[PDB]
Amino acid sequence: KATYKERAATHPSPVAAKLFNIMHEKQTNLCASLDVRTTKELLELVEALGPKICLLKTHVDILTDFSMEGTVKPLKALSAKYNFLLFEDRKFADIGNTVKLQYSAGVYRIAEWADITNAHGVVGPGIVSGLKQAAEEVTKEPRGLLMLAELSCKGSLATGEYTKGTVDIAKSDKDFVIGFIAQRDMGGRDEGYDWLIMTPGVGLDDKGDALGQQYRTVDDVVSTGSDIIIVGRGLFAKGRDAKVEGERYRKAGWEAYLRR
Amino acid sequence: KATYKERAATHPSPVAAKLFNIMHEKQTNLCASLDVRTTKELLELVEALGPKICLLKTHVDILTDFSMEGTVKPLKALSAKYNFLLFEDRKFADIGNTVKLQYSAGVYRIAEWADITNAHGVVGPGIVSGLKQAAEEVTKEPRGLLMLAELSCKGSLATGEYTKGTVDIAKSDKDFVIGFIAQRDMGGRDEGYDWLIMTPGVGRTVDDVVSTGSDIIIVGRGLFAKGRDAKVEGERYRKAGWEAYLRRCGQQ
């Protein structure tokens, strides 16, 4: 693939162009996925990881104290201050007015602040057109969508055929669908598509770390096409120093990318 | 298949047995799917349909004024008064604490009042075990889950292999997974499974779906939109669904 800088300059999606530029300018392809219970811990971790990431994945459904004033406002400030985008984990899986309101309303009003969201392809292209229209009605800010093409959970049904079907759905809107959550390259270059491949379940094979060794290494995934590494608990759990881990993973991810 | 009465006496899931008994007793296999914008419209329609249904499907994500005191409270009063179960539409599609909390917490606290829920199987067995554990922690009242084995939206990816995989996930827990939202019979009888087949998109005709194996007909707008009389439509569909049920051949 071309370099992140090059892809930024030619990408049809304003959100994708912005993200690729962030990656180049900050020399990072690291996305921190913070699934924590309190806004307090969330804001502390984001502050520490801000300079190291190109993207922050939130999980508002598990916060015990979510508030637009206390959670979203500060998050956006950090996002602007440190220059990184927001990606809400909520795995949308419906169509029409239902998915539009799940994205625009509720207490989370996700569309008002999440630069990027992701959706299951099983329901069909309707999830794309629906979220796309909600985004336009909700805010002037650009918005992007990733399709959950390949799942990592045990016994998932994201088979080769399901993945292909999801990729076809993605092709229906290159302006809004900027890529996939996947475990490998999804192609599309020959057809004029430039998809961001974001991959979760990534580790660094740390000495004596059995749990971490269950995941694929940064080198492994970046080598096979991943554009962004999604790292979660490995950055802050078990007493780890988020800022230190953030640099470790950023460094590993970037060097693997350059190696490619 | 056995009769609703017989399946009620043998089903491993308490919520399924309760549903089968309601169907047999009220002579109805009709589920009313009410996707309205206000609690007022919801309660109005439920009142009109209560006598004619075995199951009421809500869509809280689109209610503009959802509340425990204003929506759930009167709703449970209605289900108890007219004897029918509650089925929240939210199509769950995750695992772990994420799915557990989307089901038990939030403003909706769905697990606290929804007898039945449904989930996409694409994420794997974790959606079943996660929702099951959350139900257990939230209440001792019977709770059940339906897998969305066959979708009807345009370009959906619920193919034969997906459905196959979904059926296999369902087999992982016959205590909690009581059936599917599907368009046809999913088998299972030879392996000791007795799955409820609830079918949407009915208006295909009632006779058609019931004849192919549907146990419950899910009717939405066909009951209350375009100036229709929900009370009248509720009876029309109930009679049609019940009569279709009566003529299919039972297991002897």
Side-chain angles (χ1 to χ4, degrees):
Chain A
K1 320 180 190 179
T3 63
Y4 295 136
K5 178 180 175 65
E6 287 167 347
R7 299 169 70 183
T10 60
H11 205 99
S13 168
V15 175
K18 184 159 59 176
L19 183 55
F20 278 121
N21 275 142
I22 289 177
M23 296 162 70
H24 175 69
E25 303 174 15
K26 300 178 69 184
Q27 303 210 296
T28 180
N29 53 24
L30 172 66
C31 164
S33 188
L34 307 183
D35 58 323
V36 294
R37 300 188 170 67
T38 69
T39 296
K40 185 175 184 293
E41 172 167 37
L42 176 61
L43 298 175
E44 305 181 313
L45 294 168
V46 178
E47 179 97 59
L49 290 162
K52 313 298 185 176
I53 69 182
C54 66
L55 189 61
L56 172 73
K57 174 127 77 59
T58 59
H59 297 73
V60 294
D61 291 314
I62 63 178
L63 288 179
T64 67
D65 54 20
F66 174 92
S67 290
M68 279 303 277
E69 274 294 85
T71 309
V72 180
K73 172 177 288 298
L75 225 37
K76 300 296 293 187
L78 282 163
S79 167
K81 177 179 175 184
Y82 291 109
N83 189 34
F84 64 74
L85 304 184
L86 296 176
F87 168 21
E88 162 52 38
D89 189 67
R90 180 70 76 68
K91 303 184 176 63
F92 293 100
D94 211 312
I95 67 177
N97 227 316
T98 294
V99 86
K100 286 178 57 60
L101 285 174
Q102 292 175 324
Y103 175 52
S104 74
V107 302
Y108 305 113
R109 287 151 50 179
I110 298 170
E112 297 185 4
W113 52 271
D115 300 280
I116 297 173
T117 46
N118 60 13
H120 285 291
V122 76
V123 300
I127 190 157
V128 179
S129 59
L131 291 176
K132 178 191 182 71
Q133 167 175 271
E136 309 179 316
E137 305 179 312
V138 175
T139 169
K140 72 180 177 66
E141 303 312 325
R143 291 280 179 273
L145 175 71
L146 297 165
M147 295 312 290
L148 292 155
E150 294 191 305
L151 306 177
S152 297
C153 51
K154 193 169 184 180
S156 57
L157 308 178
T159 62
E161 280 299 69
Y162 180 84
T163 297
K164 177 181 294 65
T166 299
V167 172
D168 295 329
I169 287 170
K171 295 183 183 176
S172 75
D173 201 324
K174 72 202 308 181
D175 294 353
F176 190 58
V177 181
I178 67 178
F180 309 104
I181 282 297
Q183 293 295 316
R184 69 193 168 80
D185 182 73
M186 292 284 92
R189 288 176 287 289
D190 301 304
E191 309 170 63
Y193 292 101
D194 183 13
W195 294 307
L196 275 150
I197 299 298
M198 309 201 115
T199 306
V202 179
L204 288 174
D205 249 43
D206 296 313
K207 190 162 182 182
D209 176 20
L211 293 74
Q213 280 170 38
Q214 300 172 299
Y215 302 107
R216 299 171 66 198
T217 64
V218 172
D219 290 333
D220 178 10
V221 303
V222 172
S223 289
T224 63
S226 297
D227 295 315
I228 281 165
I229 52 175
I230 300 182
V231 186
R233 292 292 174 62
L235 299 170
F236 66 88
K238 304 177 183 178
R240 294 185 178 69
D241 184 340
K243 205 158 196 59
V244 166
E245 293 304 329
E247 179 51 28
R248 256 225 309 165
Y249 281 88
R250 178 203 67 74
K251 187 175 179 57
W254 195 258
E255 297 182 324
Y257 157 71
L258 289 179
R259 201 173 301 155
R260 192 171 67 185
Chain B
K1 300 185 185 184
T3 68
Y4 295 138
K5 180 182 188 181
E6 293 163 344
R7 300 165 78 182
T10 60
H11 204 95
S13 162
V15 74
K18 184 157 55 180
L19 178 54
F20 277 124
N21 275 152
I22 288 169
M23 296 162 74
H24 171 69
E25 281 170 42
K26 299 177 72 182
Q27 307 185 67
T28 178
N29 53 23
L30 171 63
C31 166
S33 190
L34 312 183
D35 60 320
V36 294
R37 186 183 66 87
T38 59
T39 292
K40 188 164 186 295
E41 298 172 80
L42 183 60
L43 301 184
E44 169 195 299
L45 291 178
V46 178
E47 187 80 282
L49 298 160
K52 309 300 174 183
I53 63 178
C54 64
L55 190 62
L56 178 76
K57 178 149 75 175
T58 55
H59 301 69
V60 302
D61 287 307
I62 65 178
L63 273 181
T64 58
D65 54 18
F66 172 85
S67 80
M68 292 304 278
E69 281 291 308
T71 314
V72 181
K73 175 178 175 182
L75 198 48
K76 296 204 72 68
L78 282 167
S79 72
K81 179 172 186 176
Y82 292 103
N83 184 32
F84 60 75
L85 302 190
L86 301 176
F87 171 16
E88 167 45 42
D89 190 74
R90 185 119 91 186
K91 301 179 179 68
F92 295 102
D94 214 319
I95 62 177
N97 293 316
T98 290
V99 85
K100 296 185 61 179
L101 295 177
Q102 296 172 329
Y103 173 47
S104 74
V107 291
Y108 304 109
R109 307 195 304 170
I110 301 173
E112 285 180 38
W113 50 267
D115 304 287
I116 298 172
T117 38
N118 55 20
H120 287 287
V122 73
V123 296
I127 193 157
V128 175
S129 60
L131 290 173
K132 182 182 188 177
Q133 186 178 63
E136 294 176 358
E137 310 184 324
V138 174
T139 179
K140 67 78 171 300
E141 298 294 345
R143 289 286 179 274
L145 179 69
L146 301 176
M147 301 307 286
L148 290 151
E150 301 186 310
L151 306 183
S152 296
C153 49
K154 192 180 190 303
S156 59
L157 307 177
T159 64
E161 287 294 359
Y162 181 86
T163 297
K164 204 283 184 180
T166 295
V167 168
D168 288 328
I169 292 169
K171 290 184 185 178
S172 69
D173 195 331
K174 67 184 173 190
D175 285 341
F176 190 58
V177 176
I178 67 182
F180 313 92
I181 281 293
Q183 288 300 310
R184 62 189 170 79
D185 185 72
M186 295 286 91
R189 294 176 288 292
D190 284 347
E191 302 85 75
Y193 293 104
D194 178 12
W195 293 310
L196 279 154
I197 303 298
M198 310 207 193
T199 306
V202 184
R204 300 165 60 192
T205 67
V206 175
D207 295 317
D208 170 35
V209 297
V210 174
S211 297
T212 51
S214 297
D215 297 310
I216 285 173
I217 54 172
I218 298 172
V219 189
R221 311 269 300 179
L223 300 172
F224 65 91
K226 302 184 179 182
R228 294 180 176 100
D229 188 342
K231 187 67 173 186
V232 163
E233 294 308 325
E235 175 53 31
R236 181 165 72 124
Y237 279 86
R238 180 206 65 72
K239 178 180 173 297
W242 190 253
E243 300 182 323
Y245 161 60
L246 292 181
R247 48 176 168 283
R248 53 188 287 84
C249 294
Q251 176 60 75
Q252 302 173 57

